[PDB]
């Protein structure tokens, strides 16, 4: 038939929409990862990191999920925990938007707010304390280094892009947070489908640690408003070997592009979706990419950024 046993199995199969006010002669095509169980790309890894943990016995009945995240990964793990019957504790600074806090409370996760001045480090700290108090009961999924992260993109997101474009995709543009998306997609298309595309990583110009690293320059991260990317470091789940190009975008332009997506394309896209498009638009208007079909990842949806500068 086509009936999913729980909500975690309904992930993926996100659509491709062709942009009309970006690129040149419709060479920019976006992938709407907002059309997911919890309305973000993270739904794929929230599912697979849990499925994998079960498969190798690290996650069993009675066990409890504890992790640190202040983005869509928390919402992704939350719905999967609920759908599959796991208790879950998520740690994050008390600096979080009340909107997302109530959303998580609606999903039945134990909220642990760490000190604001501590930030994420304090969040990871508390989460690691909790696990340490009962290492037999608690399990941390660790999105940045868990191989289950980019693996699911190699098995789903990548093949979806390949099938929908009939293998005519020449470029993939994606922001980097955990790096799992670009890694899995690139690995899928370059190795499993054997086509030598151009993988483009997008990062904030405010915190361009990938551009700085590849050039041997001094790594100097910084604050930005492009939620979802710009971790300030190189994640283990970012495979540099498959990265062909690194584009940088500023927050202000990324915001503007996201507004343009709504008012002009009729696409409810997130902030990082604007950054990814703004970068692809730049490439698309290069005569070297005029022939090339450019597929862009739109990680999330607008209504998640209601209380932000997006509106």
């Amino acid at each position: 038939m086509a009936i999913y046993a729980d909500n975690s199995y309904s992930i993926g199969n996100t659509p491709l929409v062709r942009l009309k006010h970006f690129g040149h002669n419709g060479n920019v095509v976006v992938k709407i990862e907002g059309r997911n169980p919890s309305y973000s790309v993270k739904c794929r890894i929230g599912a697979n990191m849990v499925w994998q943990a079960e498969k190798d016995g690290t996650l069993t009945k009675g066990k409890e999920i504890v992790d640190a995240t202040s983005g869509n990964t928390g919402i992704a793990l939350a719905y999967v925990a609920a759908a599959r019957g796991y208790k879950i504790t998520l740690t994050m600074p008390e600096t979080m938007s009340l909107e997302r806090k109530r959303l998580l409370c609606g999903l039945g996760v134990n909220l642990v707010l760490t000190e604001g001045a501590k930030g994420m480090k304090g969040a990871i700290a508390k989460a690691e304390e909790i696990v340490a108090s009962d290492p037999s009961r608690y399990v941390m999924l660790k999105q940045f280094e868990n191989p289950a992260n980019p693996q699911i993109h190699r098995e789903t997101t990548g093949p979806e892009i390949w099938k929908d474009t009939d293998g005519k995709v020449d470029v993939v543009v994606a922001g980097v947070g955990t790096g799992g998306s670009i890694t899995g997609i690139s690995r899928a298309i370059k190795l499993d489908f054997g086509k030598q595309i151009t993988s483009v990583a997008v990062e904030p110009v405010e915190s361009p640690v990938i551009s700085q690293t590849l050039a041997g320059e001094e790594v100097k991260p910084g604050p930005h408003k492009i939620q979802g990317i710009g971790a300030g470091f190189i994640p283990k789940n970012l495979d540099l070997s498959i990265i062909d190009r690194v584009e940088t975008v500023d927050s202000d332009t990324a915001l503007a592009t996201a507004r343009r997506l709504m008012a002009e394309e009729g696409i409810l896209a997130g902030i990082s979706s604007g950054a990814a498009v703004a970068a692809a638009d730049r490439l698309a208007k290069l005569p070297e990419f005029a022939d090339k079909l450019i597929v862009v990842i739109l990680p999330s949806a607008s209504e998640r950024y209601l209380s932000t500068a997006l509106f």
């Binding site: 930030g119 994420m120 480090k121 991260p221 492009i226 939620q227």
Partner: peptide, 8 residues
């Protein structure tokens, strides 16, 4: 003003 890790 997302920085070291958040979020993600």
């Amino acid at each position: 003003t997302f920085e070291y890790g958040d979020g993600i």
